[PDB]
Design a protein around this nucleic acid. Sequence first.
DNA 1: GTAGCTTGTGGTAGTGA
RNA 2: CCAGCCGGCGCUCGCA
DNA 3: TCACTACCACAAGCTACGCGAGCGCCG
Lengths: 95, 729, 1151
Amino acid sequence: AEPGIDKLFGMVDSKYRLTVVVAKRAQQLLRHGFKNTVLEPEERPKMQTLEGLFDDPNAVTWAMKELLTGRLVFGENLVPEDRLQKEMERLYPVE
Amino acid sequence: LSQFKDETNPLSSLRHKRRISALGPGGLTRERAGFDVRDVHRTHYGRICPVETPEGANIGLITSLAAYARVDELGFIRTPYRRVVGGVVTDEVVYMTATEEDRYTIAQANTPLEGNRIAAERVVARRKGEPVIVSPEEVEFMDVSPKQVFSVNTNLIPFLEHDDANRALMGSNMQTQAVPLIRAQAPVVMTGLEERVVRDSLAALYAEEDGEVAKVDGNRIVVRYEDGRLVEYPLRRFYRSNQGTALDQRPRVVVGQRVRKGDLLADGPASENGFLALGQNVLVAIMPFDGYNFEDAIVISEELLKRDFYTSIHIERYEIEARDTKLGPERITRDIPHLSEAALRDLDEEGVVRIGAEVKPGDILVGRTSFKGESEPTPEERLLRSIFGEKARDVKDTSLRVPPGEGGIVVRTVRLRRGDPGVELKPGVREVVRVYVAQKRKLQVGDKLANRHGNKGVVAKILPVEDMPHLPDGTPVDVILNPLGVPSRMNLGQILETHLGLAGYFLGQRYISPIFDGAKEPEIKELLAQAFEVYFGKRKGEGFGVDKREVEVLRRAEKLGLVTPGKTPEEQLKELFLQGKVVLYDGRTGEPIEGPIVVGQMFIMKLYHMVEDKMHARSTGPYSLITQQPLGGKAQFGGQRFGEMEVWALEAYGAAHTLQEMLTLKSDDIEGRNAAYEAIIKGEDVPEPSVPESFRVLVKELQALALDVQTLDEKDNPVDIFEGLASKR
Amino acid sequence: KKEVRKVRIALASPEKIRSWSYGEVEKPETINYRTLKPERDGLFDERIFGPIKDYECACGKYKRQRFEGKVCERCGVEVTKSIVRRYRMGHIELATPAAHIWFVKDVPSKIGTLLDLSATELEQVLYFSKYIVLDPKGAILNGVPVEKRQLLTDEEYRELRYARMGAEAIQQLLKELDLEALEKELLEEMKHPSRARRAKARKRLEVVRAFLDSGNRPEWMILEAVPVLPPDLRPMVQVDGGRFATSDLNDLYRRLINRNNRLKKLLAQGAPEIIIRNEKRMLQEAVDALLDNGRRGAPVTNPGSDRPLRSLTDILSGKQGRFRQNLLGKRVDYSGRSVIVVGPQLKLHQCGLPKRMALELFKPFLLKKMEEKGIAPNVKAARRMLERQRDIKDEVWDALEEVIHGKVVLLNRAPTLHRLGIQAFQPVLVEGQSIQLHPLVCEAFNADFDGDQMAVHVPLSSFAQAEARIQMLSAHNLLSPASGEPLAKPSRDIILGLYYITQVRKEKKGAGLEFATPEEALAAHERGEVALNAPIKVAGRETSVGRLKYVFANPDEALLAVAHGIVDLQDVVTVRYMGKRLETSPGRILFARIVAEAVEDEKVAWELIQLDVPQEKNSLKDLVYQAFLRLGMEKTARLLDALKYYGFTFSTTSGITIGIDDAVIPEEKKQYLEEADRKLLQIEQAYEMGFLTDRERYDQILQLWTETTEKVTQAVFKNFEENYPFNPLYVMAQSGARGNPQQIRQLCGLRGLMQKPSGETRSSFREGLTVLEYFISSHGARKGGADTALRTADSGYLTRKLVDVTHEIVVREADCGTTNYISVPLFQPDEVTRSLRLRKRADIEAGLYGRVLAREVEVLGVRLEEGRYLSMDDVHLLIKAAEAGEIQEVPVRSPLTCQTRYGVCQKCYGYDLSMARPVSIGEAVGIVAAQSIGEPGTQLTMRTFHTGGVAGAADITQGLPRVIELFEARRPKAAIDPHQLLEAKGPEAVERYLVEEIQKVYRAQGVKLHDKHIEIVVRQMMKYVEVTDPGDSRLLEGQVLEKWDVEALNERLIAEGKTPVAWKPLLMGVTKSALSTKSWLSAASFQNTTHVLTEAAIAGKKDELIGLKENVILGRLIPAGTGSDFVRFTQVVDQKTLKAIEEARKEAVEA
DNA sequence: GTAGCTTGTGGTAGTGA
RNA sequence: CCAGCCGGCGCUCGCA
DNA sequence: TCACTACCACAAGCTACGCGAGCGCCG
Ligand SMILES: [Zn+2]
Ligand SMILES: [Zn+2]
């Protein structure tokens, strides 16, 4: 099945919440350019006709691996609603 | 009441020809009242087959009749019963009305007899739908034959006596769905009617009176009867059944041949030798494989496809018309207005496709050209034309293309022009074109097959003969059945067939087991014993005895209790062979399969591949005018129904947006589906759902009804669904 | 762009008609043949409804998108698509009023009830007949002063002149009515007089308040202007050759124009009363025609098909009405379907899919991918390239193979009974037709491989793609939402193979079997095995010779001999493991090792791995359960895939195949069939002399064949147990694999003795089942297919109601703080006389598993904190302890008592989400419970009574019927009447009866589901209550309980003035509970769709959109799932954007 | 047809202005 | 970018 | 007393009836 599905499970107080997270995350990864990541160096997502997953295969599959790490943070209301879409297009280039 | 002829196979046509119905003028019977009617009533004896009815919502009401059952003067299905005065039976019979039937004491045919004398004092008989054991003295009438109580359809199952009535219907119904195989072989085991069937049905062609053979063309056969007469009998070459099936008559007689009155001439569509034949008798192994014959999953031998064993010729009659639009009659010409000469090859004849050509899904079968706009030209399409080549033929492409799925070879074509010789040309219709194309739908993995008993299954894998199970003697099986689907279902009738078929292979012969009076267990062991001489006797003289493998299993078999320990392996095997099971090597590993596995020549059949077989996959396409829900039909497949049963399922899960997606962007949402397409094409993320139409149209329905339906916001105030088409002026 | 939180059904004001209406239809000129264009201002003129062409208009001044919202200065035409037309309504100015039949003919005539006249016949009498009335004042006589509101005929009215009538008569009435005035009038009439006249006034009073309260006043009940449905809606198409199809509404919409127009001319031509009315009859009648047909006779399209032209009602209500259409939703764009075929190699994570299908499916995703590569320049180009199957390059298959990536899809089976009826997998493209499904799910969607057809879709949105591979992916949906029991249980195929390998064999013991002590018994009895005397599996307790001869060190050791053909896996050997000298079969250990292989934690493996006994369906059930628990979801997955392959390959080589001789007949039957046939005569010769009678001779014969059949059932299985432990037909039945229990022998009795057609009740299938013996059983197999037929109908239907009511039920919470708990009983009183007993293992498990303690409890020695979630291990603890005698009941949190008005807390519910850990907030439990309930309900197994005498076997089975009579307050055929029960023992009692009294069934069918689900439902049946001591509104009234927890909570606490809201708890059937719900969005869905709105219009009902049904129909995101306000808002962040906003902070320091 | 939910009204003992 | 396929009748399947 | 009905019972009225699929034809 999917990597440490259990690991991830316990990380949340409610299942359906978990879903919301990843989603809005892979949505970010695309939108503001796909270089909006936090764990690309050594180990990173991969495909096989060549090893090009490094660019843009499945977003959500990425958010998974990231979330499987303690990099990101999730809260009911962490950052002011509209002030977030302004600061996310300012530092991530990809287009 | 009147319907299309289920001409799957002459037999199918023949039953579809004998079944009774309930529903009708309406004055007789309605649809929501039938617990007491649908019941298989006691008088339904020899008059109605209590197995023939269709499983489903319309059951018991629709049902074909019994063997000899026949209507007299006024719709009273009488059934024959031989007369008997005292303890003496007669070669005389009487079709009794249901009424007059209860009046007497009738007995079965199983009843022992010396020709005209009864043989047992306490013998069975049935008063008025009541089982009663009476004396030979009060006996007044007997059943003619066990076959009389079932349909022809039902009367075709071998060991019907060992099968459950319920799975018997499945066996009976599945027979109407058989398909004419290039190579048709009558069942290794028959009841004795397959001849009659083809005879009484007009499948094969018979000889009128005694005579001799003259001409044997592939199209016509001329004969010279003994009365100095001679006739030229044309043969239906290749015709399109109403079901789109092949209809040919294959001569089987040589030139100049003294024939007997009523002897098979040319084999009907599905007659082997004037015998009803549908499907073929195949060597079969009743054992479980990995999972390829899971619950009703099945496994086939690549060996069967090599020898075009199960191949069905299927004919679809696609059709297209040249409508007369007031915008300009749609013309028919090999002119396909916009792109290649590559797709205009096979379309040899001006507009027409050349016969004997290979057609794949997407190719144009017929070219058609109507006119672009509704009445006016186009401003955006106007400037584009001028750029490359302003001079482009204004006629549009509305050409009949090969509907996705599969196409075959065009065999026949028909075209009706202006000067109608004598045809009912519908109004506006300028001219028509029918194209008959067939394809050796080679039994592929998607197809399904079944034996006359009821076992139904879809081919799970096509194993190379190379590694699939093989007998001690090189000969490999054809098919492998999953035993599991047998204990649950109740039909030992098929187990007896595989066994009996077993003897017939090394015994090279066919048999005829009447319905209840057919063969018996002991008798079968007899032949097996004898067949064991063919298998092993030959193997013994051939220079060798037994394999180290045949013994390993023999060890396990003795431990099993299948064989009485202490016997010479030669003897042991025979005893095990008589059990209906023999030793089989893995073929993949060559290691025998610990434990004898019964096998045999089981006569099985292929089943109808409706255009429901040839899969339906739709991305985008048509929608309904009123309901803006997607649909298909001709070219565009047509969407699948979600039903609430399914809604709920998603409701069970937390698939919120997944459910959102369905109700919207995927079905009813107009600007959602539209913009959605535009979105994915971009590799972007779908906008947020707009109002579905089934909804908007709904309010108005409500509004059409005095009822006023108004949308509300957080604080009870208006909101607007109709994006802006409800406001006046 | 906001969200609609409330829907509202309200009556329409004439002006509002004018409001939705665009122009007035005044003539029946559809379209003139010569020109396929709308005849005149007719029903299809585009002015009145919409642009006959895309963005284009009539003559052609403006023609594109650039000016989408402007109209042409010459002929007025703003344009979007033609939707506008299918959107816009019309209105017909009626000459003389008429009224909606819906309110007139509704059982409680909403019009005759309100206005006190013969609620029923009088209506009919003057509405469609001749009777006039007087408006404000009319000073002159007839015999009695002016009838302020009474009615007079045109004859004693004509005399006068030298007033209005028909529907024009009641028009006046409604207007002159001062609701208030009469409100004061009935309030008095209600409480003072006795129940006779006070009763009528009472029901009569709901309608009134309805109007006033809501405001929307009643004067609109009559019609004088008819809203026209847009055009596109009711079809007007070209069938073939010249044929045209048009929605029947048009046949009636024309029937109506003619008369109205015919009337405007009639009234303007000459007025001969007789014919004036003759037509008002036809008018008012045509009126009813389009609104409702059938309620009163039925209009037909001229000779061709006596079919009632489908009316508005028929369009809205029904099994395929409009609501039916919407509530269930009908056709996707990205869908597909084909035949199914097994995928052994297939891992649960994936599924096999024919490329060719895929091709059409991910068409768009592919297209884009095309241009991305060098395969195609532009979109149009890429499409043309695919327009044909011979145009495809092998490279295309790569691109597609590429776009799918890990992207996943959903699979739906035929009957979608539960959530598992559909799941997400990782499609692995394949050649051919059929579709490869994984086998163990075959049990999930009840599906075998005999022609099974299912469906499939695609999570387009990355948002929708998310959930799918996440929460819908099958691999994450192992347990059953019905029972914490797994649903990936090995099937008949794998299990069969798995049992083969682990079974131990026992053979012959002719000589000594007590090596237990002698060493000469070790030598001598060892040479006796070498000989022929002692077998390898003799019944010696210390160790049969099988153990002595062979001993294995390392695990491998032992398996090396098997293949070498020295030992078979089913042999009793001796081998040493990591720490013990164990005496076991090769198969039992092999199973052990494999266990340890899938998952590396070798030690945690054997912890639950009791390799004492041959692996049966339950032992595996208990292990899978374990695995998922102990080790974790995804890891427990890599497992399933393993067992599968092996129980598969193990099955192949096992060499098991059914043989005719395999169905072995006991030699026993001849004796017992003789010893029983002899007693039949003792009872038949009983008949000759009257010791018995008629009734008693029939019952004793029933018991003879009821006890003798159970006797032959033990024998066949006992023979297989002692003589043929390895029979393909035997071993098949014993393993979870395949078989039947009552059924085989029961089946034999059935063929031998099947009951007669009515119900009043020698051969086998191995031996010739006689002619008549086969026709007799036909009656039953015949009734069985019919019974089950109606059973599926009632099941989905029942469930349809389950949803109609529990849809809205979801987990939106903070532990419902109301700690009113239910006590779960452990002992049952009466099974015989008065006695106390320990309830069944299962049932109890079903009542306490994965729940929430209401308070702490010290039992046998451990401390069970308050609020802890008890696992099965804990649930077992209690058993052993009650066995002790320290506990009798169980304080547990439950929805029946959860506070949360609409919804329940995470604490009131429990454990089992598809997972085992506590249920995550935002779970559509209302549904999950509905399915896990409605899926079992269909099969509807056997019901009957079976009673024995001396051996004394009595069997007890009942049908859905009861289940129905249960969910619906009813008066059972013979049973405990709930209405009385409640009255006697009250709520917490009925609550308890219901639930338990409903469980008895499934328990009796082998089905095993948790009590949670049922609770959910029943609480919903008790969400309403009546009144007795008023406060805001008058007493007798049925309404929402929690809603009363609201008004009462505020009538004492906040606002002083203790006005005790004496209420009366009210019981409602599942049906009636849905029917009458706050929201009507849900009610309009089922029942007539008539009354529903009828009532909700009067009262401008503001349907607060909470719940799925109502919110689904809207196509609005579900108030739950991802729409749960709890989670619908949640932001994600990268540590880099954190310090960033932190710097938007640090820069805030001005100067 | 089949069961069954609800309303509505007429048929058979009360009881007070 | 325009059409036949509305609905329906009748018929078969999968889930016993 | 006079009289009006009051209140039980039984007939009489509308709504369900699983999910999906295909094939020929009908206006
Ligand atoms: Zn204009
Ligand atoms: Zn609670």
